[PDB]
Amino acid sequence: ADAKALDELRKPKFSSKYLIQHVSQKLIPAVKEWEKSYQPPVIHLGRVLSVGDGIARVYGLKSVQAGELVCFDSGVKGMALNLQADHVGVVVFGNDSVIHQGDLVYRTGQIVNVPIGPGTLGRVTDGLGQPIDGKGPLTNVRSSLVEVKAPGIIARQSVREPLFTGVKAVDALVPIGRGQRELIIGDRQTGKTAVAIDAIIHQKNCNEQVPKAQRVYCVYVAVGQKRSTVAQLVKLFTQTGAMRYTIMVSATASDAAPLQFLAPYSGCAMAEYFRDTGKHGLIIYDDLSKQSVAYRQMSLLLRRPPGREAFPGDVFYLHSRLLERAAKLSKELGGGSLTAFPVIETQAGDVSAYIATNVISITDGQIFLETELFYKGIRPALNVGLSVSRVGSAAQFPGMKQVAGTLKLELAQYREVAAFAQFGSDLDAATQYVLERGARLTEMLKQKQFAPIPIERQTVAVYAATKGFLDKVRVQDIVAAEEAVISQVNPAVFKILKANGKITPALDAHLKAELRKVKLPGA
Amino acid sequence: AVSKKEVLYFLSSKDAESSTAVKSYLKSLYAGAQVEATETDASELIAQLEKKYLSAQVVEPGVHNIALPLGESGSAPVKRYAAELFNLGAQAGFECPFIEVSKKFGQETATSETVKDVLNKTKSYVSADYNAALNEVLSSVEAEINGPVLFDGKTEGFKKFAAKAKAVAVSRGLPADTILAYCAGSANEDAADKVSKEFFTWFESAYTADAAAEVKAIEAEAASILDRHLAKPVAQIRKEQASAYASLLKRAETAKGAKWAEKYLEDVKAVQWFDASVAEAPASGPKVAA
Amino acid sequence: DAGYVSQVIGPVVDVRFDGELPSILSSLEVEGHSVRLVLEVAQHMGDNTVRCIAMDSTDGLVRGQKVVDTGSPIKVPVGRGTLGRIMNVIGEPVDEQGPIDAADIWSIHREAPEFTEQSTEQEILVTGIKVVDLLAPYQRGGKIGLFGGAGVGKTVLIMELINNVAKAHGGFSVFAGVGERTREGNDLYREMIESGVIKLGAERGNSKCTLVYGQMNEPPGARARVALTGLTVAEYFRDIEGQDVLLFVDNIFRFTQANSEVSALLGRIPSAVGYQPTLATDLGGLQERITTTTKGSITSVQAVYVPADDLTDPAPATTFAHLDATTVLSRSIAELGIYPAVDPLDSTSRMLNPNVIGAEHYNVARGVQKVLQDYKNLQDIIAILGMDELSEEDKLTVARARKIQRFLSQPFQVAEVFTGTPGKYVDLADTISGFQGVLTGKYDDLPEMAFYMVGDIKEVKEKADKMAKDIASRKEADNKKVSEELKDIPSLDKLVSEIKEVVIEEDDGLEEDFKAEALSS
Ligand SMILES: Nc1ncnc2c1ncn2[C@@H]1O[C@H](COP(=O)(O)OP(=O)(O)OP(=O)(O)O)[C@@H](O)[C@H]1O
Ligand SMILES: Nc1ncnc2c1ncn2[C@@H]1O[C@H](COP(=O)(O)OP(=O)(O)O)[C@@H](O)[C@H]1O
Ligand SMILES: [Mg+2]
Ligand SMILES: [Mg+2]
């Protein structure tokens, strides 16, 4: 111990010297291996016949595959989409002004692929992998194809774990399990993104509290949006902290039409990494209705014959190829999961459109947001009569399965009586009860913008609204009473309902004793 | 253990852990062990990659063993620092900096036909304040000729550029003609000696100015970090430094089986020995078994 | 000899042959593909080239890739060796349990049987669902349709039909999953493992169902032909072995949709709303093979998706003419909470003649329909005025029809997961007696909510007296449980001391797992 040496004490300590030696020890036997097996492969060429509108018709390229990435001599990439007898139709990944007639097209040999892995977490990429946030290359990442076959029947198991969004209009009435795809459909400026941003921010609040295995890693695919709209979301995910778990795949409105068509598949491939390796993913395709317009543009410029409204025939297969990749895998495959939230924008509340009726037919649930409910104050503007969840009571919170069964049972009774009592004919002292109680529940399911409520403070609030504790409280401050119902009620009763997951008989008698020692406004 | 390309680079090394590995290898050799064969293999790219990753293992304990002359008076500590970096480069297998960066220029420009691709492909090694000043002069002679200035030397379409590029070089502050006369040489040694003695004054000016710019940037970074650090309260400082130290320990403790991880934790334990040994006798320093 | 791929545009592949073109509907196999790619010849394009549709994805196809004619259509294994297995469109097993035993594999393309070999015999299929058994009774051997939009309950009703009529009946069953969700196909498979209808491993021979699955991830070539593969398994069980087959086809709409997705790539100018010019003949060529013949019988239950709750769309309106019993499920019935949401007026059957199901069934079904119809004619004035004038017989019409509307609802044995309730099987005589009671003023003493989600008319009486016992005993807990309890409710710090803490790592372990898998494989 004492009196080491002089030659032992002359060493500089935290120099690299051995990380350098580790790199040179792992590198030189690997690069002699590369040079001893190195054939420079034959590159098949092609001439550009014509070019325009982001399509280049290419002569030659006779061994090119369908869906294969090709490279122009301008540096701009492409994808061979329709192989014809005389030419190749190549959609161009970028500006087609740099491609000329007679330019050389080289085939890369490879189908379109994106870098997947945990090195994509935190980063903002474009429609194919390449990061656009100005933070260098994607370290710790691995390429894989964007068009992967979805897991079949034997590769799944039933959707049973709950996905908490933190939006109590969703987590009570239309609950969402892990592996379930749920459509957020609505009109132009409803709360569609705000439902999906709240589902992502809430996973940050749950990831700090759950063990490492059941953490949900979110991917937000932004198709056809503004570039400053998605810069407002990277700023929001940074100052909340959700960007630690979030990948953003950003194919904005100035990107080429094949980059916006392919960005939901790139984001699904970045999120299928967590599904395939036993973790849990959450993919949000913001405006699939803007991906199909990008698909219609290529299909009409590749001269594929138009169908309904102008859309190609295979536009159902466009979205069902993509949404069926959201699955809850079997325990042999890891038990991993991927939960999808496609967003579809309708025009005037017209869900009978082409792309709208396709994705309604694909996804399990539906979160239908209404612009007339938005302006009545009800925000999230969820149409509780039209919003479904096909998983339903299978994968919701057991503490709110026994409370929100009563909640939708009463709100179904609220709806038809208010259609009659707005004429002002007569009222019946129990018909008076259901349109006075359903107003307590409608104000209960309102929420602010970026504050997801965990799951236990949601079920205590619907408990206090359905077990009568919020009767004789005025309707204007039920949105203001329920902060007192969460703050003044003891913070250790939220731990028991989080740990049990259920209202035990030894807890309802304690909680309804605690919902009486609260000072409610108005009263 | 060393792999005999490890130890041939460490024969002229003078840092501690290279010299003890050399001495252990020679004490292995004296006790009846044969040398292994030298690899006459690994064609030129692998040989360059190996000397690149073997110069760094001589440079990296040598850079850490050179005291920076921060906050010093006079150019003689800057000349000490630059001469120590010169000696470390010579021990690691580099040449003179002039010869080495000229070799880098000639390696990056073996394909060069025009002066435009010369000034665009050696951009990573020439400063922007000189590359832009040569680009505007190339454009000035290109506006004269209305034909691309080519990299020939005997073509006077190049020489109309080069006579103004020498003016740019003398307006930067560096004497170009004594540099050209040094690397062109002469016949008689008495007339080449008087220009080598001027080139070496330029060279000492240049490497002292480079080492001084590096030292002033390190001083500015240290003063910026300190003035950002003296704005915090003390408990914030303690929990920040303790959190960073704990994370950097756990990143080397989750590495198990890597040589750098065992060396990292062994150096942490040696630092703790240094602290205990100056706690045992603070007037005498650490205990050195001499 | 063989042919070669000439053109790949989407899922539609042109193959060029140099002599001896394959027949139309012959299957071709691309060699050199990553997966087994089967093309099916759709038409002869004319200069020694045929146009094909692919049964898998065409990503990775190269012009000039060699294509082998098999000389026959798509041939799938049929027989008892398929009972308990899941097949593709092309007969490959997708359940990861060995190969399929394949006694006498069969082509999936056939003509409809004939006109001479039809059976004109009508007997009722009792299903347990009282709205089905009452108002549109199913024929034992005929084609049943389940119509409705998205989310009305076609899959729940077809699952209740599966475990109500398929768990014990005289022959075999074939489920053809056509272009629906993979999640519910897995749910159906696991439910039939648990229900003992499909047995795995050594008892595979005692299985009573074949699954043939063609789900939404599959290209439009596969979703257009998987219904034919389920048909071929059922046609082997009917034609060769001469026994009764149940054939459940979830979403026969997807067959028409999948044919429409390739149609304009096959060189067809588009028809009405977006469909192919050959919509009615494609649908008819499928539907006319699902027949009871003189050899056996196939009782078909097909779900039909309507696109925007729109029964005037040509894909449901074409298939309406093919079904002996069309159960139409409505969104309006589902938003009331009446489940099964069967539209009582819109659901028709050919078994609703009095000389087929008797007069005591026919007249109660027609009376229930008349009461539910003039209630709908009153309902536009109830929503405005509010039962203040309604003449003491139309008030009785509204009350009896609300009792009927609740009494058509029934808790399903497969919907115990959804709401809360154990499922009810209702016999035919029980629902005849019950609706004849409600129709003839016999049960006006009960609340109308005692009819909601009950088995039969004795469970209405078993729920009415429960409601009375309950709402007359609301006043039991207004005096206790507020203080001085039994201390079976312990203190809160005691309850949070039982919360055994889960360790939280704060490392996320991701970048080590990635390099662990990078040093793996
Ligand atoms: N729960 C909410 N409470 C209050 N305001 C909300 C809520 N949700 C959304 N908003 C407001 O509504 C506006 C529209 O929200 P959002 O951006 O989600 O619209 P959108 O449905 O995504 O439509 P688009 O895609 O056209 O932007 C936002 O400015 C937001 O401030
Ligand atoms: N008999 C029923 N009882 C309770 N709920 C039902 C019933 N039938 C349908 N539902 C509800 O309707 C939802 C959608 O039904 P589903 O089976 O998906 O029909 P489809 O396949 O036509 O969309 C289900 O999640 C379920 O909650
Ligand atoms: Mg938006
Ligand atoms: Mg369905």
Q: Are residues A155 and A211 part of one domain?
A: yes
In a domain, C499, yes or no: no
Q: Are residues C80 and C13 part of one domain?
A: no
- By DSSP bridging, strand A216-223 and strand A182-186 are unpaired
Q: Whose CA is nearest to atom 8 of ligand 1?
A: A191
d(CA C275, CA C268): 10
Q: Could you tell me the CATH number of the domain that includes residue C65? A: 2.40.10.170
Q: Are residues C384 and C269 part of one domain?
A: no
- Measured from the Cβ of residue B146, the count of other Cβ atoms closer than 10 Å reads 6
- Compute the distance from residue C155 Cα to the ligand 4 centre, in Å: 5
- Compute the distance from residue A196 Cα to the ligand 2 centre, in Å: 25
In a domain, A72, yes or no: yes
Q: Where are the alpha helices (DSSP H) in C215-330?
A: 220-239, 253-261, 279-287, 314-319
Q: How far apart are the CA of A410 and the nearest CA of chain C, in angstroms?
A: 12
* Pocket of ligand 2 contains residue C185 by CB under 6 Å: no
Residue of B nearest to A17 (CA): B57
Chosen domain end from C39, C58, C73: C73
The reply to whether A393 sits in an annotated binding site is: no
Q: Is C87 helix (H, G, I), strand (E, B) or coil?
A: strand
Structure tokens that stand for A447 in this block = 């929420």
* Pocket of ligand 1 contains residue A194 by CB under 6 Å: yes
In the block, tokens 């990277």 appear at: A234
Burial (CB count <10 Å: 0-12, 13-18, 19+), residue B220? exposed
Catalytic residues of C: 154, 180-181
User: Does B271 reach chain A within 8 Å, measured CB to CB?
Assistant: yes
What angle in degrees, to the nearest 10, is found between the helix axes of C394-407 and C428-439?
A: 160
Residue of B nearest to A19 (CA): B260
Total domains in chain C come to 3
Q: Are residues C303 and C281 part of one domain?
A: yes
Say how far residue A33 (Cα) sits from the centre of its chain: 42
Q: Whose CA is nearest to atom 9 of ligand 2?
A: C153
Q: Which helix (H) or strand (E) holds A421?
A: helix A404-421
Sign of CA dihedral A160, A163, A166, A167: negative
Q: Are residues A164 and A55 part of one domain?
A: no
Sign of CA dihedral A174, A176, A180, A183: positive
Q: Whose CA is nearest to atom 14 of ligand 2?
A: C151
Read off the amino acid at residue A275: R
CA A135-A137-A139 angle, to 5 degrees, is 105
CA C468 to each of CA A372, A474, B61, C25, C446: distance values in angstroms, whole numbers, following the listed order: 41, 32, 90, 66, 10
Phi, psi of C159, rounded to the nearest 5 degrees: -75, -35
Catalytic residues of A: 390
Q: Is C173 helix (H, G, I), strand (E, B) or coil?
A: strand
Instruction: Tell which one of A192, A344, A374, A446 to mutate to probe ligand 1, the residue whose CB is within 8 A of the most ligand atoms.
Output: A192
CA C58 to each of CA C9, C61, C63, C107, C220: distance values in angstroms, whole numbers, following the listed order: 9, 6, 11, 23, 11
Q: Are residues A410 and A504 part of one domain?
A: yes
- Compute the distance from residue C351 Cα to the ligand 4 centre, in Å: 26
Q: Is B70 helix (H, G, I), strand (E, B) or coil?
A: coil
The reply to whether A379 sits in an annotated binding site is: yes
d(CA C324, CA A501): 49
Structure tokens that stand for C320 in this block = 């309406």
State the DSSP code for C23: P
Q: Are residues A182 and A107 part of one domain?
A: no
Read off the amino acid at residue C260: S
Beta bridge partners, C15, equal: C5, C50
- Best mutation site among A18, A34, A37 for testing chain B: the one with the most B CBs within 10 Å? A18
Q: Are residues A461 and A411 part of one domain?
A: yes
CB contact under 8 A, B16 and A3: no
Chosen domain end from A74, A94, A112: A112
d(CA A25, CA B50): 10
- By DSSP bridging, strand C12-17 and strand C3-9 are antiparallel
In the block, tokens 């008087």 appear at: B194
Q: How far apart are the CA of A395 and the nearest CA of chain C, in angstroms?
A: 10
Q: Where are the alpha helices (DSSP H) in A137-256?
A: 168-173, 192-207, 227-240
Say how far residue C224 (Cα) sits from the centre of its chain: 16
DSSP string, B217-279: HHHHHHHHHHHHHTTS-HHHHHHHHHHHHHHHHHHHHS--S-HHHHHHHHHHHHHHHHHHHHH
Q: Are residues C103 and C59 part of one domain?
A: no
User: Does A310 reach chain C within 8 Å, measured CB to CB?
Assistant: no
- Compute the distance from residue A366 Cα to the ligand 4 centre, in Å: 14
Read off the amino acid at residue B16: A
In contact, A385 and A447? CB cutoff 8 Å: no
d(CA C164, CA B231): 77
d(CA B66, CA B59): 11
CB contact under 8 A, A158 and C507: no
Residue of A nearest to B279 (CA): A2
In contact, A178 and A341? CB cutoff 8 Å: no
State the DSSP code for A96: G
- Compute the distance from residue C418 Cα to the ligand 4 centre, in Å: 15
Q: Could you tell me the CATH number of the domain that includes residue A363? A: 3.40.50.300
- Measured from the Cβ of residue B155, the count of other Cβ atoms closer than 10 Å reads 12
Q: Which domain holds residue A93?
A: 43-112
| Residues 6 or more apart in contact with residue B170 via CB below 8 angstroms | B176, B177
Q: Please count the CA atoms within 13 angstroms of the CA of C187 that sit on its side-chain side.
A: 18
CA B73 to each of CA B50, B212, B215, B221: distance values in angstroms, whole numbers, following the listed order: 40, 11, 12, 19
Burial (CB count <10 Å: 0-12, 13-18, 19+), residue C178? buried
Q: Where are the alpha helices (DSSP H) in C262-330?
A: 279-287, 314-319
Q: Which helix (H) or strand (E) holds C354?
A: helix C354-357
Q: Which helix (H) or strand (E) holds C334?
A: helix C331-335
State the DSSP code for C3: E
Set of chain B residues whose Cβ sits within 8 Å of the Cβ of A35: 43, 45-46
d(CA C328, CA C347): 5
d(CA A450, CA A379): 12
Structure tokens that stand for B208 in this block = 């002292």
Interface of A with C in 259-298 (CB under 8 A): 277
Burial (CB count <10 Å: 0-12, 13-18, 19+), residue A398? middle
Q: Which atom of ligand 1 is nearest to the CA of A446?
A: 1
d(CA A74, CA A79): 15
Q: Is A264 helix (H, G, I), strand (E, B) or coil?
A: helix
Phi, psi of C365, rounded to the nearest 5 degrees: -65, -40
CA A88-A93-A94 angle, to 5 degrees, is 125
Instruction: Tell which one of A198, A288, A449 to mutate to probe ligand 1, the residue whose CB is within 8 A of the most ligand atoms.
Output: A449
Binding residues of C for ADP: 151-156, 181, 339, 418
Phi, psi of C66, rounded to the nearest 5 degrees: -75, 140
Beta bridge partners, C138, equal: C125
d(CA C404, CA C411): 15
In contact, C156 and C423? CB cutoff 8 Å: no
Q: Is A89 helix (H, G, I), strand (E, B) or coil?
A: strand
In contact, A185 and A367? CB cutoff 8 Å: yes
CB contact under 8 A, A17 and B61: yes
Read off the amino acid at residue C6: S
Burial (CB count <10 Å: 0-12, 13-18, 19+), residue A421? middle
What angle in degrees, to the nearest 10, is found between the helix axes of B76-91 and B44-63?
A: 140
Q: Could you tell me the CATH number of the domain that includes residue C176? A: 3.40.50.300
Q: Which atom of ligand 1 is nearest to the CA of A229?
A: 27
Structure tokens that stand for C404 in this block = 């009927």
State the DSSP code for A393: G
First vs last C-alpha separation in chain A: 76
Ligand found nearest the CA of A366? 2
d(CA A235, CA A124): 11
Chosen domain end from C24, C58, C73: C73
Q: Which helix (H) or strand (E) holds C134?
A: helix C130-135
CA A488 to each of CA A56, A455, A496: distance values in angstroms, whole numbers, following the listed order: 66, 17, 16
What angle in degrees, to the nearest 10, is found between the helix axes of B16-30 and B44-63?
A: 120
CA A94 to each of CA A267, B165, C365: distance values in angstroms, whole numbers, following the listed order: 19, 40, 66
Say how far residue A268 (Cα) sits from the centre of its chain: 9
CB contact under 8 A, B260 and A21: yes
In contact, A58 and A87? CB cutoff 8 Å: yes
Instruction: Tell which one of C127, C156, C215 to mutate to probe ligand 2, the residue whose CB is within 8 A of the most ligand atoms.
Output: C156
Q: Are residues A464 and A320 part of one domain?
A: no
- By DSSP bridging, strand A216-223 and strand A246-251 are parallel
Q: Are residues A283 and A143 part of one domain?
A: yes
Burial (CB count <10 Å: 0-12, 13-18, 19+), residue A68? buried
User: Does C356 reach chain A within 8 Å, measured CB to CB?
Assistant: no
Q: How far apart are the CA of C316 and the nearest CA of chain A, in angstroms?
A: 15
Structure tokens that stand for A257 in this block = 């039409």
Q: Where are the beta strands (DSSP E) in A287-400?
A: 337-345, 365-369
In a domain, C483, yes or no: no
Interface of C with A in 214-243 (CB under 8 A): 215-217, 219-220
Structure tokens that stand for C78 in this block = 């049929």
Q: How far apart are the CA of B196 and the nearest CA of chain A, in angstroms?
A: 37
Q: Could you tell me the CATH number of the domain that includes residue A107? A: 2.40.30.20
In contact, A470 and A440? CB cutoff 8 Å: yes
d(CA B200, CA B196): 6
* Pocket of ligand 1 contains residue A166 by CB under 6 Å: no
| Residues 6 or more apart in contact with residue B35 via CB below 8 angstroms | B4, B29
Chain breaks in chain C (C to N over 2.5 A) after: none
- Measured from the Cβ of residue B25, the count of other Cβ atoms closer than 10 Å reads 19
User: Does A106 reach chain C within 8 Å, measured CB to CB?
Assistant: no
Q: Are residues C189 and C124 part of one domain?
A: yes
Q: Are residues A54 and A75 part of one domain?
A: yes
In contact, A113 and A144? CB cutoff 8 Å: yes
Nearest alpha-carbon partner for C227 in C244, C242, C247? C247
User: Does B30 reach chain A within 8 Å, measured CB to CB?
Assistant: no
Q: Are residues C309 and C171 part of one domain?
A: yes
d(CA A98, CA C501): 61
In the block, tokens 């629906």 appear at: C180
| Residues 6 or more apart in contact with residue B146 via CB below 8 angstroms | none
d(CA C188, CA C198): 10
In a domain, A522, yes or no: yes
Q: Are residues A349 and A488 part of one domain?
A: no
Structure tokens that stand for C156 in this block = 């729940």
Beta bridge partners, A106, equal: A45, A71
CB-CB: which of A2, A23, A28 is closest to B46? A28
Q: Are residues C139 and C54 part of one domain?
A: no
3-state DSSP of A275-310? HHCCCEEEEEEECHHHHHHHHHHHHHHCCCCCCCCC
Interface of A with C in 134-173 (CB under 8 A): 140, 142, 147, 149-154, 156-159
Instruction: Tell which one of C418, C425, C454 to mutate to probe ligand 2, the residue whose CB is within 8 A of the most ligand atoms.
Output: C418
Q: Are residues C261 and C238 part of one domain?
A: yes
Nearest alpha-carbon partner for C34 in C71, C16, C15, C61? C61
In contact, C247 and C297? CB cutoff 8 Å: no
* Pocket of ligand 2 contains residue C254 by CB under 6 Å: no
Q: Where are the alpha helices (DSSP H) in B73-188?
A: 76-91, 97-108, 115-121, 128-145, 156-172, 176-182
d(CA C53, CA C71): 16
Q: How far apart are the CA of B60 and the nearest CA of chain A, in angstroms?
A: 6
- By DSSP bridging, strand A68-72 and strand A77-83 are antiparallel
CA B160-B163-B165 angle, to 5 degrees, is 105
Helices (H) and strands (E) in chain C, counts: 15, 18
State the DSSP code for C182: H
Read off the amino acid at residue C300: S
State the DSSP code for C311: T
In contact, C25 and C73? CB cutoff 8 Å: yes
d(CA C385, CA C387): 6
Total domains in chain A come to 3
Q: Are residues C86 and C63 part of one domain?
A: no
In the block, tokens 């179904």 appear at: A412
Residue of A nearest to C496 (CA): A496
- Compute the distance from residue A252 Cα to the ligand 3 centre, in Å: 12
In contact, A356 and A175? CB cutoff 8 Å: no
Interface of C with A in 385-424 (CB under 8 A): 385-386, 388, 417-420
Percent helix, strand, coil in chain A (nearest 5)? 40, 20, 40
Q: Where are the beta strands (DSSP E) in C55-132?
A: 66-69, 75-76, 86-87, 106-107, 124-125
d(CA C495, CA A505): 12
d(CA C359, CA C97): 52
Structure tokens that stand for A459 in this block = 């079920």
- Compute the distance from residue A397 Cα to the ligand 2 centre, in Å: 20
Q: Which domain holds residue C238?
A: 74-351
d(CA A373, CA C30): 55
Q: Are residues C163 and C294 part of one domain?
A: yes
Q: Are residues C304 and C229 part of one domain?
A: yes
Burial (CB count <10 Å: 0-12, 13-18, 19+), residue A307? buried
Q: Are residues A395 and A369 part of one domain?
A: no
d(CA A314, CA A317): 5
Phi, psi of A169, rounded to the nearest 5 degrees: -70, -25
d(CA C388, CA C199): 61
d(CA C361, CA A147): 56
Q: Are residues A294 and A217 part of one domain?
A: yes
Q: Are residues C358 and C258 part of one domain?
A: no
Tell me if the bond preceding C219 is cis, omega within 30° of 0.
no
Chosen domain end from C39, C73, C107: C73
Sign of CA dihedral B254, B259, B263, B264: negative
Q: How far apart are the CA of C119 and the nearest CA of chain A, in angstroms?
A: 37
Structure tokens that stand for A154 in this block = 């034997």
| Residues 6 or more apart in contact with residue A177 via CB below 8 angstroms | A159, A160, A161, A162, A163, A328, A339, A391, A394, A395, A396
